[PDB]
Amino acid sequence: SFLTLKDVDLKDKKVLVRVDFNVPVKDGKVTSKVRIEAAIPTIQYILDQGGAVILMSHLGRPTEGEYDSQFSLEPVAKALSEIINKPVKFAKDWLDGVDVKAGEIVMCENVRFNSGEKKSTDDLSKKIASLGDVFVMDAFATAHRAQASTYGVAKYIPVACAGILLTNEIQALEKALKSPKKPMAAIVGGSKVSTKLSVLNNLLDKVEILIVGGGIANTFIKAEGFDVGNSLYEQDLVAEATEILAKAKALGVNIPVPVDVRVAKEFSENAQAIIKKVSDVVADEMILDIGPESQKIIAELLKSANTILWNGPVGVFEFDNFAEGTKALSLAIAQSHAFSVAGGGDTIAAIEKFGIKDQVSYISTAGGAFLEFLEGKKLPAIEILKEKAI
């Protein structure tokens, strides 16, 4: 395992916390408070245990060795101060030491400004580590990248553990991917198979039901030999999709390839959907959504599931005439008592549109980290936390 805040000594300790404070900024004011409000339980626990909080985060895309004001975390410090109702000192030159007492909060300048952050150089990692006694990794969105303030600091700090947010995230993802309650259904939607091929390969031997969506499903329809016309699909990944369908068949995994679809003759919000059987798609037409019979099959399957992993829609739900497939998917997940884990920008946009946020067990706000976890890849920041637990 890895250590958590509940099993480390924090009383009269300089505690370095790596948070996700990559918040949007406009006219020297932050425009979102969600990421700041999310870190509050971790900070309050450290403060109540009698420690000193040293906050660390990245903000935007700056160049290492180039301090740029538009990338500074000073508006984030000011926002947190107004939220937690406690003073937050901003340390511009943090690496040269941080003067903090127990019960105080100090916000470091953006890490990505320092040389060696992305590479996780021993020199910078040793310097960050010398600033404190405890390191708390609470930024899951950067766990898939080995950086000095995510990975290196853990190597040299006396004690390294995981914050309340990273704990909850890893607990939820592992409850879906490592130890699920069968049957388990995974939904993998997206534009290309190539982009989610490592995900599909990793889920195939873990899931009972594998639902494919969007451009991914269209390549599977062509793999099943039906003409997809002018739909979005990968002709070069058709042979790979056929192999995935054969592996699934042998494994006893259900891939409910659409039996019916909703086509269009123009890719727009003004286009009208035409319900066709999967075998009746014309050279002119575009599959933009699944059809009503496919909707009911997915609903009935998701009804039986005890674990649901959701990564993508089954259609172009942004267009109301092609939103019925994803709406029915969303409502089936919402009505389910299964432990449901959702992740992906499009997935979250679907949850928001269909208003089922409070009916999804856990919603991941991470992009690349959620996907790399789903690929079965070992995230460097979680791994170093496990090595430090031994």
Q: Could you give the 3-state DSSP secondary structure of residue 96?
A: coil
DSSP state of 337: -
DSSP state of 11: T
Tell me how far CA of residue 39 lies from CA of 42, 114, 320, in angstroms: 6, 23, 36
Angle at 48 between CA 55 and CA 170, to 5 degrees: 60
C-beta neighbour count of 16 within 10 angstroms: 27
* Residue type at 25 in one-letter notation: V
Q: How far apart are CA 339 and CA 22, in angstroms?
A: 29
Tell me how far CA of residue 28 lies from CA of 24, 38, 79, 167, in angstroms: 10, 21, 10, 32
Q: Could you give the 3-state DSSP secondary structure of residue 195?
A: helix
Q: Could you give the 3-state DSSP secondary structure of residue 384?
A: helix
Q: How far apart are CA 119 and CA 23, in angstroms?
A: 23
Resolution (A): 2.7
- φ/ψ (deg, to 5) at 261: -140, 170
C-beta neighbour count of 280 within 10 angstroms: 14
348, with CB counted inside 10 A (0-12, 13-18, 19+), is: middle
User: What is the secondary structure of 224-291 as a DSSP string?
Assistant: TT---TT-S--GGGHHHHHHHHHHHHHHT-B----SEEEEESS-STT---EEEEGGG--TT-EEEEE-
C-beta neighbour count of 364 within 10 angstroms: 24
Q: Is the peptide bond before 183 cis (omega within 30 degrees of 0)?
A: yes
Please answer whether residues 91 and 108 qualify as being in contact, where contact means their C-beta atoms are separated by less than 8 angstroms: yes
C-beta neighbour count of 225 within 10 angstroms: 10
Looking at domain 1-163+378-390, its CATH class is alpha beta
The shares of helix, strand and coil residues in the chain, as percent rounded to the nearest 5, are 40, 15, 40
Q: What are the binding residues? A: 20-22, 35, 58-61, 112, 145, 196, 318, 344-347
| Sign of the CA dihedral running 1, 337, 186, 361 | negative
User: Which residues have a Cβ under 8 Å from the Cβ of 83 and sit 6 or more positions away?
Assistant: 33, 36, 37, 40
Domain extent listing, the chain:
1-163+378-390, 164-377
Q: How far apart are CA 345 and CA 30, in angstroms?
A: 21
- Tell me the catalytic residues: 35, 192, 345, 368
Write down the CATH superfamily of domain 164-377. Phosphoglycerate kinase, N-terminal domain (3.40.50.1260)
Equal CATH topology for 1-163+378-390 and 164-377: yes
Q: Could you give the 3-state DSSP secondary structure of residue 42?
A: helix
Q: What are the binding residues for substrate? A: 20-22, 35, 58-61, 112, 145
120, with CB counted inside 10 A (0-12, 13-18, 19+), is: buried
- Helix ranges (DSSP H) in the chain: 34-48, 74-84, 122-130, 153-156, 164-177, 197-203, 215-223, 238-251, 292-304, 324-335, 345-354, 368-374, 380-387
Q: What are the binding residues for ATP? A: 196, 318, 344-347
